[PDB]
Amino acid sequence: QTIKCVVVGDGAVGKTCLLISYTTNKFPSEYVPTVFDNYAVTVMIGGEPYTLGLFDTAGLEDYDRLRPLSYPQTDVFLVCFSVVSPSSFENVKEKWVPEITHHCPKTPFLLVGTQIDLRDDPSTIEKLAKNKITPETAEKLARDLKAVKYVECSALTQRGLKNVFDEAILAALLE
Amino acid sequence: KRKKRVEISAPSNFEHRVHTGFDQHEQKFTGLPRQWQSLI
Amino acid sequence: SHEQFRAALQLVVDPGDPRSYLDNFIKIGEGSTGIVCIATVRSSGKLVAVKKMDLRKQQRRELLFNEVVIMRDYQHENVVEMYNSYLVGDELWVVMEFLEGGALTDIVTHTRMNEEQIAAVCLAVLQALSVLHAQGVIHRDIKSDSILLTHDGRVKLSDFGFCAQVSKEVPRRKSLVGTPYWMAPELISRLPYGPEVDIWSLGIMVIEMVDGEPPYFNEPPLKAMKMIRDNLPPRLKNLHKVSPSLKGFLDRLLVRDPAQRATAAELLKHPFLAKAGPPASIVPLMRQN
Ligand SMILES: Nc1nc2c(ncn2[C@@H]2O[C@H](COP(=O)(O)OP(=O)(O)NP(=O)(O)O)[C@@H](O)[C@H]2O)c(=O)[nH]1
Ligand SMILES: [Mg+2]
């Protein structure tokens, strides 16, 4: 039948690139703010076709007025934080989960760590070091929150990318 | 029936159904879902 | 990635093409990974089974390594003998002994087994599982379909495609593997799990042997999994037809907490298994008789 999956999180976190890398195996080189995009793909689940509807929402505060119009009939959420932005990780707890809990309290959600390949990149670690997240920290927040589970991935290298949507898809169909 | 597994395949059939944008000039949305247009 | 896998497999199989010594390839069944044929050895007339698995049609190609490695490195009375494997075109072919008694499934859908036969089957599977689990091999797909019988009623475990290895370095697996109605609740919850998942699945198979089918079978697979995940352990429906010995046995298998589920070695000493009839007692239940 049909699974609805909405992707929310702070701006610049990598929600669009996640979705475009999954659906088409391409990276968008530039950074354009999302207002709203809806995609769909077919996914085979034990030989039976499902439409995975993917609702790419604005992280930017400019388009708050619009975002929750995506939320009715949602089967699963991906609450995204970049693992190289502590501010976006704290906004999972402080903002995003409160939003989706209020509009969609019975709807399961997964915490998605994005941009995990920049955990090695020294360029960005310097600006984390001078200003002064790991799986074990996010997994606690997932168990507390209470997300279905924690998953993480990189849209560039596709590490654990398929697994994000695999667990999202299972989460939706169980509940 | 009893031999149905939970293999989740790779995606196929990409479909970009909606692209909403924002007019710089008129402070307006372009490419809304027509359902939402009444609301705001 | 297709070629790299094909070359990987090439180096692991036996060389050549078994069509060079086998005739009369006739389809016997289908599976998730592929089809099983019977074939004849040209020189002797001995029947063998041949499992054919297309490399392009697997969702996780790496699981095809198990189809070779397990029967190769875990030979045992209660495991299906594997003679050879080969790479023919884009297919993994595994030649193995033909088990003429068929699957346990055929029996439990068309007949009711008594407790002496149930104990005989359970005993054989646990003998196999205890040996596999001692080496950290988890089968991950125990059900009636994975248990095959000889002519004389001896029980062998098959379908190793979904196996995994645990060790001190990797004590748990995370993969969603198996067949919905037989899956352990911790596996469905997406927690790390161990060899205990096989014991749950065995418990579900004991429900097959007494009630004819697994719990929640009339429901769709995904809703059944939610039910297995959230509900208390399922019960035997035919309680009128069951001993306290069997009920006590099944209560050691169907424990939600993996830590308090019995191990295979622990279960080999259980009193219910003292009821086990020999090979012969399963022969009447076969479709022939
Ligand atoms: N190294 C790395 N960089 C990434 C990854 N994903 C995104 N980025 C970087 O971060 C930027 C964020 O892009 P985008 O996916 O549009 O983020 P967004 O969450 O949709 N922002 P908005 O909510 O305003 O639309 C990208 O342009 C890219 O340079 C990733 O997986 N790895
Ligand atoms: Mg964007």
XYZ file of C-alpha atoms and ligand atoms in Angstrom:
537
model
C 0.000 0.000 0.000
C 1.581 3.394 1.120
C 4.011 4.642 3.811
C 4.255 8.342 4.648
C 7.657 9.441 5.992
C 8.300 13.075 7.019
C 11.893 14.303 7.510
C 12.399 17.241 9.933
C 15.366 18.846 11.689
C 17.453 22.013 12.026
C 18.499 23.789 8.806
C 21.692 22.739 6.960
C 21.511 19.290 8.727
C 21.307 17.250 5.472
C 17.659 16.209 5.058
C 17.379 16.820 1.299
C 20.786 15.270 0.485
C 19.789 12.216 2.538
C 16.581 11.858 0.479
C 18.128 12.536 -2.945
C 21.072 10.149 -2.293
C 18.630 7.394 -1.210
C 16.107 7.868 -4.027
C 18.459 8.661 -6.982
C 22.144 7.968 -5.926
C 23.207 11.624 -6.486
C 24.528 14.364 -4.178
C 23.286 17.945 -4.630
C 26.619 19.831 -4.825
C 25.169 23.183 -3.672
C 23.099 24.073 -0.596
C 19.579 25.339 -1.409
C 17.052 25.824 1.440
C 13.984 23.561 1.176
C 10.547 25.194 1.340
C 8.697 21.936 0.769
C 9.298 18.938 -1.514
C 7.346 15.681 -1.739
C 8.968 12.621 -3.365
C 7.817 9.039 -3.801
C 9.575 5.749 -4.438
C 8.481 2.136 -4.734
C 10.020 -0.221 -2.215
C 9.492 -3.976 -2.304
C 8.723 -5.496 1.084
C 8.789 -9.280 0.742
C 7.867 -9.089 -2.960
C 4.863 -6.777 -2.295
C 5.153 -3.149 -3.558
C 4.722 -0.118 -1.267
C 4.834 3.572 -2.135
C 7.203 5.341 0.253
C 6.042 8.969 0.296
C 8.820 11.263 1.464
C 8.019 14.722 2.750
C 11.069 16.969 2.728
C 10.253 19.897 5.031
C 11.925 23.229 5.777
C 14.337 23.335 8.709
C 14.655 27.128 8.371
C 12.542 29.235 10.714
C 11.224 31.365 7.785
C 8.815 28.590 6.686
C 7.493 27.483 10.127
C 3.951 28.529 9.049
C 4.023 25.764 6.419
C 5.799 22.774 8.033
C 3.036 21.057 10.093
C 0.685 20.923 7.080
C 2.876 17.888 6.215
C 2.041 16.083 9.476
C -1.503 14.661 9.120
C -1.551 10.867 8.358
C 2.205 10.462 9.039
C 3.325 6.843 9.488
C 6.925 7.570 10.627
C 9.284 10.567 11.181
C 13.008 10.998 10.706
C 14.131 13.591 13.236
C 17.487 14.615 11.841
C 20.535 16.080 13.581
C 23.999 16.445 12.035
C 26.457 14.574 14.286
C 28.870 17.562 13.857
C 26.266 20.115 15.159
C 25.555 19.868 18.918
C 22.930 22.643 18.572
C 20.872 20.536 16.119
C 21.186 17.488 18.439
C 19.881 19.517 21.418
C 17.000 20.795 19.199
C 15.871 17.158 18.727
C 15.188 17.145 22.501
C 14.128 20.807 22.828
C 11.981 21.466 19.717
C 11.508 18.817 16.988
C 10.202 15.967 19.150
C 7.782 18.327 21.002
C 6.485 19.449 17.572
C 5.792 15.945 16.248
C 4.571 14.578 19.631
C 1.937 17.373 19.768
C 0.649 16.884 16.205
C 1.242 13.110 15.945
C 1.510 11.422 19.400
C 0.929 7.765 18.263
C 3.368 8.128 15.347
C 6.732 6.329 15.720
C 9.956 8.244 15.037
C 13.644 7.480 14.525
C 16.582 9.676 15.459
C 18.816 10.020 12.415
C 22.425 11.105 12.823
C 23.553 12.628 9.498
C 26.983 13.614 8.083
C 28.886 10.884 10.035
C 31.786 10.970 7.493
C 32.806 14.441 8.829
C 33.640 12.765 12.185
C 37.111 12.107 10.631
C 37.444 15.448 8.721
C 39.955 17.686 10.633
C 38.710 20.991 9.099
C 35.398 20.850 11.023
C 36.791 19.221 14.234
C 38.928 22.363 14.797
C 35.780 24.546 15.080
C 34.246 21.953 17.443
C 37.512 21.918 19.465
C 37.940 25.719 19.703
C 34.254 26.243 20.672
C 34.767 23.412 23.242
C 27.978 13.296 19.203
C 28.752 9.551 19.487
C 26.372 6.539 18.979
C 26.184 5.881 22.742
C 25.030 9.482 23.468
C 22.363 9.486 20.722
C 21.199 5.931 21.601
C 20.479 7.108 25.168
C 18.468 10.060 23.825
C 16.595 7.634 21.505
C 15.726 5.240 24.386
C 14.656 8.194 26.595
C 12.600 10.010 23.997
C 11.267 7.342 23.105
C 12.384 6.904 19.482
C 11.886 3.509 17.790
C 15.659 3.415 17.587
C 18.787 5.385 16.689
C 20.347 5.131 13.237
C 23.091 7.105 11.529
C 24.423 7.633 8.049
C 26.312 9.742 5.522
C 24.518 10.998 2.384
C 27.855 11.372 0.541
C 29.343 7.897 1.141
C 25.930 6.191 1.712
C 27.219 4.385 4.867
C 24.168 3.072 6.742
C 21.966 5.104 4.335
C 19.777 2.231 3.170
C 19.526 1.109 6.818
C 17.987 4.500 7.821
C 15.048 3.915 5.501
C 14.958 0.155 6.175
C 14.354 0.820 9.909
C 12.010 3.773 9.165
C 9.957 1.504 6.878
C 9.747 -1.287 9.458
C 8.812 1.259 12.176
C 5.911 2.549 10.021
C 4.453 -0.886 9.184
C 4.606 -2.343 12.706
C 2.665 0.669 14.170
C 2.066 -17.049 2.527
C 4.149 -18.766 5.226
C 7.393 -18.197 3.262
C 6.951 -14.372 3.049
C 10.096 -12.639 4.366
C 10.849 -9.045 5.422
C 13.381 -8.157 2.738
C 13.235 -4.404 2.107
C 14.490 -3.808 -1.434
C 16.401 -0.799 -2.742
C 14.055 1.992 -3.879
C 12.864 2.328 -7.472
C 10.441 4.587 -9.378
C 11.520 8.096 -8.376
C 8.690 10.595 -8.559
C 9.063 14.299 -7.633
C 5.372 15.072 -7.044
C 5.598 18.538 -5.395
C 8.111 21.424 -5.376
C 7.008 24.411 -3.315
C 9.024 27.651 -3.715
C 9.001 31.212 -2.312
C 8.580 34.381 -4.427
C 11.216 36.963 -3.470
C 9.122 39.788 -4.991
C 5.505 39.119 -3.916
C 6.071 37.373 -0.513
C 4.069 34.430 -1.885
C 4.307 30.662 -2.250
C 4.562 28.997 -5.656
C 3.796 25.282 -6.104
C 1.657 24.723 -3.011
C -0.533 21.635 -2.696
C -4.024 22.974 -3.639
C -5.377 21.408 -0.413
C -3.237 23.791 1.692
C -3.904 26.990 -0.359
C -7.185 27.697 1.487
C -5.565 27.346 4.931
C -2.677 29.841 4.598
C 29.626 -4.619 -6.785
C 28.155 -7.631 -8.674
C 31.422 -8.789 -10.221
C 33.422 -8.391 -7.017
C 30.933 -10.695 -5.295
C 30.910 -13.154 -8.179
C 34.738 -13.348 -8.065
C 34.670 -13.694 -4.289
C 32.270 -16.649 -4.678
C 34.331 -18.175 -7.495
C 37.312 -18.619 -5.151
C 35.190 -20.210 -2.383
C 33.250 -22.829 -4.439
C 34.572 -26.051 -5.958
C 35.762 -25.610 -9.549
C 33.714 -26.605 -12.586
C 30.161 -27.354 -13.611
C 28.153 -30.213 -12.033
C 26.117 -30.643 -15.260
C 29.245 -32.579 -16.302
C 28.258 -35.458 -13.887
C 24.531 -34.784 -13.121
C 21.414 -35.400 -15.262
C 17.642 -34.729 -15.103
C 17.378 -31.427 -13.253
C 13.738 -31.198 -12.180
C 12.343 -28.438 -9.952
C 11.264 -29.806 -6.524
C 10.526 -26.481 -4.800
C 11.038 -22.737 -4.446
C 12.561 -20.735 -1.574
C 13.386 -17.084 -0.833
C 16.982 -17.406 -2.108
C 16.055 -19.706 -4.992
C 14.907 -23.088 -6.285
C 15.702 -26.689 -5.315
C 15.999 -29.383 -7.986
C 16.489 -33.092 -7.855
C 19.226 -34.507 -10.080
C 20.737 -37.892 -10.865
C 24.443 -38.837 -10.746
C 25.131 -40.251 -14.269
C 27.575 -43.012 -13.259
C 25.667 -44.486 -10.271
C 22.016 -43.358 -10.555
C 22.129 -41.778 -7.052
C 19.725 -38.917 -6.504
C 20.952 -35.633 -5.079
C 19.342 -32.281 -4.302
C 20.631 -29.130 -5.956
C 19.895 -25.671 -4.584
C 20.229 -22.917 -7.193
C 20.497 -19.300 -6.085
C 20.814 -16.377 -8.518
C 23.381 -13.843 -7.261
C 21.444 -10.935 -8.819
C 18.166 -11.812 -6.991
C 19.327 -11.744 -3.328
C 18.669 -8.713 -1.142
C 21.851 -9.495 0.828
C 24.366 -11.329 -1.370
C 26.770 -11.863 1.574
C 24.290 -14.361 3.069
C 25.134 -16.722 0.162
C 28.489 -17.390 1.836
C 26.609 -19.266 4.612
C 25.095 -21.670 2.050
C 28.596 -23.042 1.449
C 30.520 -22.511 4.704
C 27.994 -23.987 7.206
C 27.297 -27.516 5.890
C 31.032 -27.568 4.937
C 32.380 -26.753 8.466
C 29.548 -28.153 10.672
C 29.022 -31.770 9.558
C 26.773 -33.570 12.047
C 24.162 -36.403 12.052
C 21.376 -33.795 12.420
C 22.723 -31.422 9.696
C 22.058 -31.886 5.931
C 25.167 -33.241 4.145
C 26.573 -30.844 1.533
C 28.754 -32.543 -1.082
C 29.886 -29.660 -3.295
C 29.125 -26.107 -4.407
C 29.695 -24.416 -7.747
C 29.368 -21.200 -9.658
C 27.291 -21.769 -12.789
C 26.669 -18.536 -14.729
C 25.166 -16.025 -12.264
C 24.064 -18.778 -9.832
C 25.361 -20.492 -6.723
C 24.553 -24.191 -6.985
C 24.884 -26.329 -3.870
C 24.692 -30.100 -4.281
C 23.552 -31.931 -1.156
C 21.936 -35.168 0.014
C 18.354 -35.680 -1.096
C 16.181 -36.103 1.984
C 13.313 -38.323 0.928
C 11.083 -37.832 3.976
C 10.453 -34.180 3.038
C 9.957 -31.214 5.351
C 8.325 -31.384 8.773
C 5.838 -28.797 7.451
C 4.100 -31.415 5.279
C 3.440 -33.483 8.413
C 2.137 -30.741 10.746
C -0.280 -29.258 8.163
C -1.828 -32.697 7.327
C -1.594 -34.598 10.665
C -1.415 -34.329 14.455
C 1.792 -35.765 15.940
C 1.802 -37.337 19.400
C 4.234 -36.314 22.164
C 6.756 -39.149 21.528
C 7.184 -37.944 17.945
C 7.324 -34.270 19.027
C 10.012 -35.105 21.597
C 12.006 -37.036 18.940
C 11.986 -34.040 16.607
C 12.786 -31.545 19.357
C 15.631 -33.766 20.599
C 17.273 -33.915 17.135
C 16.979 -30.162 16.533
C 18.440 -29.388 20.000
C 21.320 -31.800 19.424
C 22.106 -29.842 16.258
C 21.507 -26.407 17.792
C 23.696 -27.171 20.848
C 26.605 -28.028 18.563
C 26.045 -24.920 16.385
C 25.528 -22.591 19.409
C 28.701 -23.869 21.125
C 30.594 -22.444 18.118
C 28.548 -19.243 18.106
C 26.538 -20.119 14.994
C 22.933 -18.845 15.176
C 20.627 -20.469 12.580
C 18.036 -17.638 12.590
C 15.369 -19.478 10.642
C 14.166 -22.406 12.682
C 10.663 -23.499 11.687
C 8.994 -26.694 10.412
C 10.079 -25.882 6.804
C 13.784 -25.975 7.796
C 13.611 -29.487 9.274
C 13.971 -32.338 6.793
C 13.480 -36.068 7.301
C 15.170 -39.196 5.930
C 13.222 -42.317 4.759
C 13.690 -43.929 8.192
C 12.652 -40.800 10.166
C 15.994 -39.234 11.166
C 15.750 -35.477 11.508
C 18.140 -33.021 9.876
C 18.394 -29.274 10.040
C 18.651 -27.383 6.719
C 18.279 -23.832 5.277
C 21.463 -22.239 6.657
C 21.220 -19.202 4.363
C 20.319 -16.779 7.170
C 23.047 -17.808 9.665
C 25.362 -15.544 11.605
C 28.424 -15.942 13.788
C 28.934 -14.627 17.350
C 32.116 -14.555 19.407
C 33.878 -12.605 22.170
C 34.556 -9.850 19.627
C 30.915 -9.745 18.346
C 28.631 -11.273 21.024
C 25.320 -10.037 19.504
C 23.790 -9.720 16.059
C 21.402 -6.889 15.047
C 19.970 -8.067 11.703
C 16.267 -8.411 11.035
C 16.411 -11.948 9.723
C 13.993 -14.871 9.686
C 10.347 -15.583 8.933
C 7.813 -13.227 10.637
C 5.704 -15.719 12.620
C 8.771 -17.515 14.025
C 10.832 -14.407 14.943
C 11.866 -13.796 18.537
C 10.470 -10.701 20.222
C 13.928 -9.154 20.956
C 14.837 -9.542 17.278
C 11.604 -7.760 16.234
C 12.220 -5.014 18.850
C 15.593 -4.406 17.102
C 17.629 -5.142 20.237
C 20.967 -6.961 20.006
C 20.333 -10.724 20.215
C 22.214 -14.052 20.453
C 21.676 -17.826 20.034
C 18.550 -17.568 22.238
C 16.502 -16.445 19.180
C 16.683 -20.021 17.833
C 15.143 -21.386 21.034
C 12.135 -19.064 20.753
C 11.729 -20.112 17.120
C 11.912 -23.754 18.239
C 9.149 -22.931 20.729
C 7.055 -21.568 17.872
C 7.753 -24.820 15.977
C 6.461 -26.819 18.977
C 3.266 -24.754 18.685
C 3.187 -25.792 14.978
C 3.421 -29.477 15.965
C 0.562 -29.282 18.522
C -1.832 -26.646 17.042
C -0.947 -27.030 13.321
C 0.311 -23.499 12.692
C 2.286 -20.719 14.384
C 0.554 -18.095 16.541
C -1.156 -15.209 14.680
C -0.977 -17.085 11.347
C -4.392 -15.925 10.086
C -3.090 -12.305 10.453
C -0.762 -10.631 7.922
C 3.001 -11.074 8.658
C 3.731 -7.489 9.739
C 0.811 -7.251 12.159
C 1.751 -10.685 13.608
C 5.272 -9.352 14.253
C 3.868 -6.388 16.182
C 1.766 -8.875 18.155
C 4.820 -11.074 18.890
C 6.788 -7.959 19.885
C 4.217 -6.379 22.218
C 2.231 -9.330 23.653
C 3.015 -11.904 26.301
C 4.241 -15.261 24.988
C 1.685 -17.151 22.916
C -0.166 -20.169 24.274
C -1.010 -23.625 22.982
C -4.639 -23.680 21.826
C -5.058 -27.506 22.164
C -4.485 -27.513 25.948
C -6.812 -30.519 26.250
C -4.271 -32.580 24.200
C -1.060 -31.656 26.106
C 0.967 -33.016 29.062
C 2.419 -30.995 31.966
C 5.769 -32.300 30.632
C 5.194 -30.638 27.238
C 3.756 -27.446 28.781
C 6.806 -27.276 31.066
C 9.069 -27.723 28.051
C 7.344 -25.033 25.986
C 7.515 -22.568 28.918
C 11.327 -22.808 28.792
C 11.297 -21.954 25.070
C 8.771 -19.138 24.940
C 10.293 -16.717 27.493
C 10.327 -13.042 26.405
C 13.497 -12.266 28.357
C 16.307 -13.957 26.316
C 18.406 -14.226 29.529
C 15.848 -16.587 31.160
C 15.039 -18.600 28.047
C 16.674 -22.044 28.329
C 19.816 -22.821 26.274
C 19.999 -25.814 23.918
C 22.397 -27.657 26.246
C 20.060 -26.993 29.201
C 17.070 -28.279 27.208
C 18.785 -31.554 26.192
C 18.454 -32.570 29.864
C 14.692 -31.733 30.063
C 12.218 -34.579 31.054
C 9.872 -34.085 28.075
C 12.766 -35.292 25.830
C 12.933 -38.571 27.814
C 9.627 -39.319 25.967
C 11.436 -39.192 22.597
C 10.569 -42.104 20.345
C 13.218 -43.396 17.928
C 13.476 -42.536 14.185
C 10.869 -45.214 13.287
C 7.933 -43.522 15.111
C 7.929 -40.524 12.687
C 7.650 -42.755 9.539
C 3.843 -43.344 9.693
C 3.195 -39.553 9.630
C 4.928 -39.156 6.220
C 2.694 -38.467 3.173
C 3.435 -41.911 1.712
C 1.899 -43.657 4.768
N 29.895 15.541 4.465
C 28.548 15.531 4.346
N 27.931 16.717 4.102
C 26.585 16.789 3.972
C 25.789 15.556 4.086
N 24.504 15.912 3.920
C 24.476 17.254 3.706
N 25.721 17.771 3.741
C 26.092 19.195 3.546
O 25.164 20.046 4.229
C 24.314 20.728 3.299
C 22.850 20.572 3.728
O 21.989 20.336 2.612
P 20.435 19.947 2.751
O 20.292 18.451 2.583
O 19.642 20.883 1.863
O 20.070 20.273 4.283
P 18.544 20.539 4.732
O 18.328 19.824 6.008
O 17.482 20.029 3.627
N 18.343 22.252 4.949
P 16.768 22.973 4.895
O 15.875 22.356 6.078
O 16.868 24.576 5.022
O 16.178 22.643 3.584
C 24.655 20.175 1.912
O 24.651 21.186 0.899
C 26.009 19.521 2.065
O 27.072 20.393 1.672
C 26.533 14.299 4.356
O 25.927 13.215 4.475
N 27.874 14.361 4.469
Mg 17.427 21.450 1.445
